[PDB]
Amino acid sequence: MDVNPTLLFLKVPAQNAISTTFPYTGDPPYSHGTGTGYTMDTVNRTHQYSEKGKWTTNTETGAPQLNPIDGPLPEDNEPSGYAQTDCVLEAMAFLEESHPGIFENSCLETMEVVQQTRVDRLTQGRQTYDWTLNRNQPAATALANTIEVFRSNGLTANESGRLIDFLKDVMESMDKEEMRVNKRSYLIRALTLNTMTKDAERGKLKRRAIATPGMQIRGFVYFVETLARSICEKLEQSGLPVGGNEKKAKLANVVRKMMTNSQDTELSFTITGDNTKWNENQNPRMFLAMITYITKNQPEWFRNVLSIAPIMFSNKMARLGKGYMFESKSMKLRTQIPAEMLASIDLKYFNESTRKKIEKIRPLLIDGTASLSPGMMMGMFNMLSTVLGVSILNLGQKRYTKTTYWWDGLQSSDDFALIVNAPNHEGIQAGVDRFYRTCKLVGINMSKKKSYINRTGTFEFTSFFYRYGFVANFSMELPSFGVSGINESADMSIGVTVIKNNMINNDLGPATAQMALQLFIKDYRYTYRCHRGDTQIQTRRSFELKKLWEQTRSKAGLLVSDGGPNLYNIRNLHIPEVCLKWELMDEDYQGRLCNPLNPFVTTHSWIPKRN
Amino acid sequence: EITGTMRRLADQSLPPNFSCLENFRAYVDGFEPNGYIEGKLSQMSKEVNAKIEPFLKTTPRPIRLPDGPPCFQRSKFLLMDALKLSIEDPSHEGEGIPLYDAIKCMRTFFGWKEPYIVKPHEKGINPNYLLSWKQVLAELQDIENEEKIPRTKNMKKTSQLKWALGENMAPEKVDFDNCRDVSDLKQYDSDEPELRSLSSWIQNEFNKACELTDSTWIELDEIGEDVAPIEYIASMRRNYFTAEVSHCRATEYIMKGVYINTALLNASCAAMDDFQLIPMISKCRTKEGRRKTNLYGFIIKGRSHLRNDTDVVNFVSMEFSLTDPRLEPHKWEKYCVLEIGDMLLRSAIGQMSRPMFLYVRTNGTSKIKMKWGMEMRRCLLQSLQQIESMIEAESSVKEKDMTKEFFENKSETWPIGESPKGVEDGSIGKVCRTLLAKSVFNSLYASPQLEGFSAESRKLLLVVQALRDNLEPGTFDLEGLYEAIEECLINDPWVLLNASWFNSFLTHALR
Amino acid sequence: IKCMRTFFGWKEPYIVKPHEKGINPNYLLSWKQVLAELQDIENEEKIPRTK
Amino acid sequence: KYPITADKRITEMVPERNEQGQTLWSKMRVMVSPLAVTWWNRNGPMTSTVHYPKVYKTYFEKVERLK
Amino acid sequence: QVQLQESGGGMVQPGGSLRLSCLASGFTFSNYAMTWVRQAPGKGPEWVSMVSNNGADTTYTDSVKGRFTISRDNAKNTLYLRMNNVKPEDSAVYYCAKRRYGGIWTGQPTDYDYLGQGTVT
RNA sequence: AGCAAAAGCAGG
């Protein structure tokens, strides 16, 4: 006899059993090799996407920069990031006409936050790119680095404590011709963006090569993303800032609002999918135009300090990475070759696919780091791109499509789910071809390979699969369910809090969460050796546990790390442990516990010796 | 505080039509919509347009699996053919440093013939692995009989092991200028690997690996009492689940893998410069006796300095085996089988007295794969998550909300079996077992081929459900899906078998 | 050691019988040395056959 | 062994070894053993003060809502 | 009405095994924890084991660890007890009882209900 | 030799 899980997937509904196609219960593949090849291929691809677009060299950089906007209309259905700014502006105009007062209110929220904000918040990031060592490093060291170099500079904003003056003086000394780095080299070094191959990319075969920005642009993107968070919060079609079960309800609510078919003489289909090349075919020029339109009738300085992000998006010279590691076959010897010399080396040592890639990029190499700005930086949490693409969905208000058919839905950073109506398959085909065309006229490229379309009731979006009324979700996988490794007092607390967060936010059912706590306490005891008092397992410690366990008066009322039982369950997870045990304990134990005489302070808590 | 140079960069960042920031700002602030979009649309080429089509019933051809050599196993430890030398139920207070429990179990078995190879490797040097195994046995007897009981033993350097791990195989870093004169150099042999064809062996391994073993293989402790309703529902679901799962052979692989990877990571973080012996030791409680430390097989860990987690560590692995090779020589092109004599199995009549062979293959795993093989209890948990998701879906479509409706009833409601001119149906037991083992093999044969296949089969199967329920689905480009699937089907047998399963599913579904 | 490890019920040592000759505390501390030596060797050394 | 770190003040209160003899603290502050904790909780000063529910009595209020 | 009828007992030889079953009827079974309590002829009873509602929290006497295994099946509302390595002193009359509360540790082992039978070896 | 992949390890 043969066996197959695919036939349980035959009968069973696909969306409910969809997790069976979620094989991520094991380590992600990762990139052992330097991502630089994938980087070169991504840059090759985007510059091929905009090859019709002209480029002109930027001043003081030496670098070709391509501006796809006002390029021609594309020729073929193969994607291409060709758009027209007028589309963007009329889109935003129809948006503000639809949502009056939203722009000014979000603008005022941006004013008050920039006035109240402080530098202290940004430094709690992960792996901002430093420029001194020319390598990605933590953010605290990054802030120390920039404030000390600024103390060396003629500016004094690091002493101010405020943030927008800090950004301004960053800009001022950034315009300086020397720090020990000349102006051209310094502007190439400030705009530089590490390549840093993607890790943990679940659901592909080749790698995206997420590139990351530096701290200096981080505050500008922070301000503009705060605006985006405000405006999307006041929006009803965003998917990113809306989250949890509220987002879960928002999905169902928009499909409710559009699936209600009054005078249902018209058939209806509801696309889902994934807009390929999102980080490539988009552009910062459209973002700058949007920004200029969004803060209409506002303080001019605010306009400028929020327009500064898309311009430095509009010219960026990311690195390539480490380089390669050539090797001798006969003599059997190898070396790493930093690609900073790659604009000098012959085209014979390499692999042929690699060779053709080099000659494609070798013209586009200035200081060795590749220059490009027809396309967005890979893997930023921009979400103003959602503010863009949602306007397309807003165009399908029947006032403004000005025809019988019309679209609407929601759209996160890469996923999208339209909902249309028209009197026939022919009319729906007409309107959806119109949409796809429009969406390309703004420079957004809906893939024709890994997308699809269907009657209403079933549609994917952001992995929150929505069958007719069921809203199963597989956004993020369960993580670890193991100890945090600090002490027997808080590790347990940390684990329970993590379990609570992931049952309240995500779809950790209680049926698995009790089992998770079960594995957690197993690991807790096996790590700190401290099984139950009333047991038969041996270790170092078990003497004192079998001693205290009879020493007590109330037996089950004991903390777990000393012989105690675990009274937790899904009812009482937010609370700590000793609150649940306190008045179930006798005064001897309780007096021994909470006492300042302990060196431990909470007596279970402590600091381990460093190693 | 723009300083103008930013106004320079800005004016250079804009579209070609507008040459300044200020004219741009004035245009935008003085902007209005005039219906440009319709002129743009009518202006456009009609070629640029996404045309729907009927994703018809007969359209999706059977995905063609790649052709080439047969698929070959790559697991870090064999799965069906292995066996375990029991310890026969030691006491409860006696802890054991694992070497001595292993040694006790190896000491239990007699039936060791002279070693002579049974399978020609066809590459490498088979005698050297024979002499490696010899070194192992000799080192073990010699340490334990006549030394001061070392907790952990690291082997002696020899021609055999040092060959099988290649401590000389490393080349050395050098500068560019000194070697640029050389022309032998190449960037790297960075290219696609050899194709592989599906075969029957992996299917048999899976069938055996879903099957019930006899022991219990996992315990589970107590937690705070149950008062609220949702607590009771969680309790009953998890109890059903673990009771059904515990008698798996998948769970056997789970605890085996976890102990193996924990031991290796302990060693590598704690010991790098030394060939270490470790057993594939696992703790299992007998259904009717005491805790039993099973000895699956020995390991000879190779030296491991992990400057990064991604780095590979190589080693050698010895796991005993009853079933002969040469019945399925395609399954291993990689093993190096020895003969180690007879083991006197007892059947209901007579005595079997089958020979005993050993599969001293070599390998190398990772740091990362070791971590994620340590965390397969998560994978068990994930199987539970999936089943619970199924049941909550059935509870949303029907307000009965009855877990008990499926967990225990004798009702043929789940097909997982394909037979000649037939389809078999099973209960939730076999299916929980199977989902688990699928996830375990995902954890064992994790490979980007799998993830690509998973996404693409997911999208196409979703389309096929949309089709089979008469939801008028459409797809713009389909052969893109097919070629990308064929791109991701490179060599991995598990991927290949999921693909043949997809195929036969298409056929028996008829979409 | 396994058998001594089995038993729990160890109070503090205080003599119960006056020897009336010699020095009782010294034998108490001898027994203390025994227990300490045994726990210390077995927990954190390379398993010496004879101590 | 000796995961835990703590001051020299503990050295006065508790011995270097327990009844079995296995050690609670040793010098190269002093490293302390987890056994040292479970020796405190068997024998230590018992005091009926309720100052520590200064703020920990808050969580009891949240549990009264449950039960 | 609440009644607990037990069975499965009998004569055995020292060092053997036995599987005691307890059928309860008349109340909500899955809610209350259960207990085995034995009594030797001449000596007052002593609690043998206490088992939870989930069947995850189990506790035995200080002299029966490793030899016993208590469990329960909620379908037939029944209680199982596996006794292995029967010592001669375990020769007593065994009792199946239903705790006051649904807990195990909250309160000392005492019961408030009826009983069935128990064999001796 | 191996691991595993459109690039790296096989110690520095």
Burial E58-82 (b: 16+ CB within 10 A, else e): bbbbeebeebbebebebeebbbebe
Please report, rounded to whole angstroms, the spatial distance between the CA atom of protein residue A206 and the C1' atom of nucleotide F5. Answer: 10
- Asked if residue B102 lies in contact with residue B320, where contact means CB atoms within 8 angstroms, the answer is no
The SS3 of residue A343 is coil
Domain ranges, residue E101 = 1-121
* Packed helices B36-43 and A85-98: angle between N→C axes, nearest 10 degrees: 140
Residues of B in contact with A391 (CB under 8 A): none
DSSP state of A21: G
Q: Which of B178, B176, B179 is nearest to A328 (CA)?
A: B179
Q: Which two tokens stand for residue A105?
A: 């209110």
Local structure of residue B474 (DSSP, 8 states): B
Pairing, β A323-328 against β A334-338: antiparallel
Give B337's strand partners: B359
Own/partner pairs for B188-195, CB < 8 Å, 24+ apart?
B188/A324, B188/A325, B188/A326, B188/A327, B188/A351, B190/A33, B190/A37, B190/A351, B190/A354, B191/A351, B192/B490, B193/B490, B193/B491, B194/B68, B194/B69, B194/B491, B195/B66, B195/B67, B195/B68, B195/B69, B195/B490, B195/B491
DSSP tag of B174: -
Q: Tokens for D34?
A: 């987890």
β-sheet bridge partners, residue A607: D5
Structure tokens at A286: 């459209």
Residue A119 tokens, joined: 């530098």
* B448, closest nucleotide (Cα–C1'): F5
Radius of gyration of chain E (CA): 13
Q: What is the count of structural domains for chain E?
A: 1
Q: What element of type H or E holds B363?
A: strand B354-364
Q: Can you tell me the distance from the alpha carbon of A474 to that of A15, in angstroms, rounded to the nearest whole number?
A: 11
D6 three-state secondary structure? strand
For residue B11, count CB atoms less than 10 angstroms from its CB and return exposed for 0-12, middle for 13-18, buried for 19 or more: middle
What distance in Å separates the CA atoms of residue B502 and residue A4, rounded to the nearest whole number?
A: 9
Query: Is A389:A444 a contact under the CB 8 Å cutoff?
Result: yes
Phi, psi of A606 (to 5 degrees): -175, 175
Rounded, the Å distance between the CA of B438 and C1' of F7 is 29
**How many other CB atoms are there within 10 angstroms of residue A81's CB atom?**
28
Resolution in A: 4.2
Is residue A388 within 8 Å of residue A442, measured between CB atoms? yes
The closest of B89, B460, B467, B495 to B294, measured between CA atoms, is: B89
What Rg value do the Cα atoms of chain B yield, rounded? 30
Closest residue of chain E to B232, computed from CA coordinates? E54
Q: Give B461-464's long-range contacts (Cβ < 8 A, gap of 24+).
A: B461/A9, B461/A14, B461/A21, B461/B502, B462/A14, B462/A15, B462/A18, B462/A452, B462/A460, B463/A452, B463/B55, B464/A14, B464/B60, B464/B506, B464/B509, B464/B511
* Residues ≥6 apart with Cβ < 8 Å to B205: B73, B79, B80
What residues does B376 pair with on adjacent strands?
A: none
Cα distances (Å, whole numbers) of residue B171 to A33, A220, A463, B175, D17:
17, 47, 46, 13, 53
How many whole angstroms separate alpha carbon B429 and alpha carbon B64? 33
Q: What is the C-alpha to C-alpha distance for residues D33 and B134, in angstroms, rounded to an integer?
A: 43
How far is it, in rounded angstroms, from Cα B294 to Cα A243? 48
CB A27 within 8 Å of CB A40: no
E24 CA vs F2 C1’ separation (Å):
62
Provide the chain E residues 10-29 that lie in CB contact (below 8 A) with chain B.
none
* CB atoms E65 and A565 under 8 Å: no
Residues recorded for chain E: 121
Question: Rounded distance, CA C39 to CA C32, Å?
Answer: 11
Of chain D residues 8-67, which have a CB less than 8 A from chain C? 17, 19-23
Q: Tell me how far CA of residue A123 lies from CA of A136, A219, A306, A448, A558, in angstroms.
A: 14, 10, 20, 42, 41
* Helix/strand/coil for B187: coil
Neighbors of chain D by Cβ distance (3+ pairs < 8 Å): A, C
* Residue B384 and residue B403 in contact, taking contact as beta carbons nearer than 8 Å: no
In degrees rounded to 5, what are phi and psi of residue A558?
-135, 145
> Which residues, in sequence order, are CB contacts of B12 under 8 Å at separation 6+?
A56, A58, A59, A65, A315
Q: Provide φ and ψ at A397, rounded to 5°.
A: -80, 135
Closest CA to A277 of A48, A71, A79, A72: A79
Whether B188 and chain A come into contact, CB under 8 Å, resolves to yes
Residue that the structure tokens 């003056």 belong to = A165
Q: By the 8 A CB rule, do C8 and E62 touch?
A: no
Token look-up 């390998």 returns B363
Rounded to whole angstroms, how far apart are CA atoms D64 and B222? 25
With distances taken from each CA to the C1' atom of nucleotide F1, the closest residue turns out to be: B124
Give the gap in angstroms from C-alpha A543 to the nearest C-alpha of chain C: 7
Where does residue B128 fall: left (phi above 0), alpha (psi -120 to 50 degrees), or beta otherwise?
alpha
Q: Which of A543, A548, A551 should one mutate to test binding to chain C, selecting the residue with the greatest count of C CBs within 10 A?
A: A543
**Strand pairing partners for A128?**
A137
CA pseudo-torsion sign D26, D28, D33, D36 = positive
| Burial of B189 from C-beta contacts in 10 A (0-12 / 13-18 / 19+) | exposed
Residue A282 and residue A377: Cα distance in Å, rounded?
A: 10
- Mutual orientation of helices A300-313 and A215-234 as an angle, nearest 10°? 110
Is the Cβ–Cβ distance between E108 and E56 less than 8 Å? no
> Within a 10 A sphere around the Cβ of A181, how many other Cβ atoms?
15
Q: Do the bridges between strand B354-364 and strand B314-321 make them parallel or antiparallel, or are there none, so unpaired? A: antiparallel
Cβ contact A587–D48 (<8 Å)? yes
> Is the distance from CB of A44 to CB of A361 less than 8 angstroms?
yes
Is the Cβ pair C39, D20 closer than 8 Å? yes
Which of B421, B416, B412, B451 is closest to B432 using CA atoms? B416
A298: which 2 tokens? 């506002």
* Beta carbons of A285 and A67 less than 8 angstroms apart: yes
- Scanning the structure block, which residue is given the tokens 């315009």? A175
Q: What CA–CA distance (Å, rounded) separates A593 from A185?
A: 62
Contacts of A556 in chain E (CB under 8 A): 103-106
Across B210-287, where does the E strand assignment appear? 276-285
Contacts of B223 in chain E (CB under 8 A): 54, 56-57
Q: Give the Cα separation of A472 and A462 in Å (integer).
A: 11
